[PDB]
Write a protein that binds this ligand. Structure first.
Ligand SMILES: CC(=O)N[C@H]1[C@@H](OP(=O)(O)OP(=O)(O)OC[C@H]2O[C@@H](n3ccc(=O)[nH]c3=O)[C@H](O)[C@@H]2O)O[C@H](CO)[C@@H](O)[C@@H]1O
Ligand SMILES: *[C@H](C)[C@H](O)P(=O)(O)O
Length: 419
């Protein structure tokens, strides 16, 4: 099992080109199960979850290939049970269910996996599909859905905001008979990107990006060419990397408007930020960041996917700052690991109270999920001495070539294999 050995401290500065969003590429790949003409998806990041999704789609009978772009021809899909091994390793696999039921009248998918940061039920996906007319039963761990004929449009008032369930309902509604209105819909940029991809195929959707999405079902979806938007979490991760190391960075192929909350908190931390049509620059002017208070919540509020990274920022910042996590109930595993590197923090229920220190010390650490693992690698870059982050395959799920990108910013990092 691979690890990253990092030698610190190193000031991270330079430039990085942001890859396509992990969390837009994934729902779009599964939405392609609805397409009855070939599709070309551009700017797809080379990530472990994308590899898993391509294999999963192939096992359903879709013809899939890639490089920068992924090409999919789902016209001959003929298997409606997703394979357990591919389903259980990530969260995105749940998105195979809705398209299979909407287009073929049936689908079976085991409960998903992915980030171990909460119980992560899928009750809202099930409830939404049931409201669209699907009959669903859970048996031996598989969610089995079916419908005789087409799904039927419905006015669905989500009783909890959910990125994934909004996607499931929106995608399935594109082939339903009639109009579907999703209330309390998640507004994330990836939902807007998935909607625009579906519209490219011929779907009729409006309201994406707002709390109310209206879908008018059509008989079938066609094909198209679509470019995935930039990864806002990767962008935020590199901006934090520059901030905590008192450096400067320019992120290219970025989309500033997907990061209003994050950029505002970085400015509160003392960063000098400028933005262009497709880039973001951050300069600390050699200064240590100032601690900030943060509360995660659904988009456009501060994203839970940037929470571990900002915990790190506060732990090396000037002063005390808190990080309140309201979206997931078990997303503080990075804290005890950063404490072993010399950080000072206390956890009070859903909030981490951070007291910034001047410098961290290298240590052997390990994170059990994607963003926590990336945060430990960033800590290693600025810590004094050697840090070894174990189980880094978690990072591969959401970052394309983080090693090369950090190295280009000045990091001393090596991927060590086999012990
Ligand atoms: C593959 C992907 O896109 N992953 C992202 C997606 O995950 P994901 O789609 O799983 O996020 P959700 O928004 O659905 O989850 C938010 C909250 O709702 C709860 N919930 C969710 C679904 C459901 O059926 N029932 C339920 O109770 C969750 O367990 C959590 O407490 O959005 C999260 C929140 O921005 C991100 O952190 C993930 O990186
Ligand atoms: C970590 C939360 C990842 O983004 P997911 O794919 O498991 O959601």
């Amino acid at each position: 099992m691979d690890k990253f050995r990092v030698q610190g401290p190193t000031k991270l500065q330079g430039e990085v080109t942001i890859s396509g969003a992990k969390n837009a590429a994934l729902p779009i790949l599964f939405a392609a199960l609805l397409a009855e003409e070939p599709v070309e998806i551009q700017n797809v990041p080379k990530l472990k979850d994308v590899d898993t999704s391509m294999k999963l789609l192939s096992q359903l009978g879709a013809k899939v290939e890639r490089x920068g772009s992924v090409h999919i021809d789902a016209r001959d899909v003929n298997v409606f049970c997703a394979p357990y091994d591919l389903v259980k390793t990530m969260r995105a696999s749940i998105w195979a269910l809705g398209p299979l039921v909407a287009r073929f009248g049936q689908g079976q998918v085991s409960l998903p996996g992915g980030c171990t940061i909460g119980a992560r039920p899928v009750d809202l996906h099930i409830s939404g599909l049931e409201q669209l007319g699907a009959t669903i039963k859970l048996e031996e761990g598989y969610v089995k859905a079916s419908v005789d004929g087409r799904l039927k449009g419905a006015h669905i008032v989500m009783d909890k905001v959910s990125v994934g369930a909004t996607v499931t309902i929106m995608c399935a509604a594109t082939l339903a008979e009639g109009t579907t209105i999703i209330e309390n819909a998640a507004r994330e940029p990836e939902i807007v990107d998935t909607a625009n991809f579906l519209i490219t195929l011929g779907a009729k959707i409006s309201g994406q990006g707002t709390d109310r999405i209206v879908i008018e079902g059509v008989e079938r979806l066609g094909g198209g060419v679509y470019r995935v938007l930039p990864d806002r979490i990767e962008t935020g991760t590199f901006l934090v990397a520059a901030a905590i190391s008192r450096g400067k960075i320019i992120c290219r192929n970025a989309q500033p408007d997907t990061l209003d909350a994050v950029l505002a908190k970085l400015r509160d931390a003392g960063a000098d930020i400028e933005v262009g049509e497709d880039w973001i620059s951050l300069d600390m002017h050699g200064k240590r960041p100032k601690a900030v208070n943060v509360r995660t919540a659904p988009h456009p509020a501060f994203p839970t996917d940037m929470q571990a990274q900002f915990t790190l920022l506060n732990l090396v910042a000037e002063g005390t700052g808190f990080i309140t996590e309201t979206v997931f109930e078990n997303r503080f595993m990075h804290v005890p690991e950063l404490s072993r590197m010399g950080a000072h923090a206390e956890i009070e229920s859903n909030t981490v109270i951070c007291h910034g220190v001047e410098k961290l010390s290298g240590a052997q650490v390990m994170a059990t999920d994607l963003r926590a693992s990336a945060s430990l690698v960033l800590a290693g870059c600025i810590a004094e001495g050697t840090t070894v982050v174990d189980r880094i395959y978690h990072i591969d799920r959401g970052y394309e070539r983080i090693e090369d990108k950090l190295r280009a910013l000045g990091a001393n990092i090596e991927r060590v294999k086999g012990e």
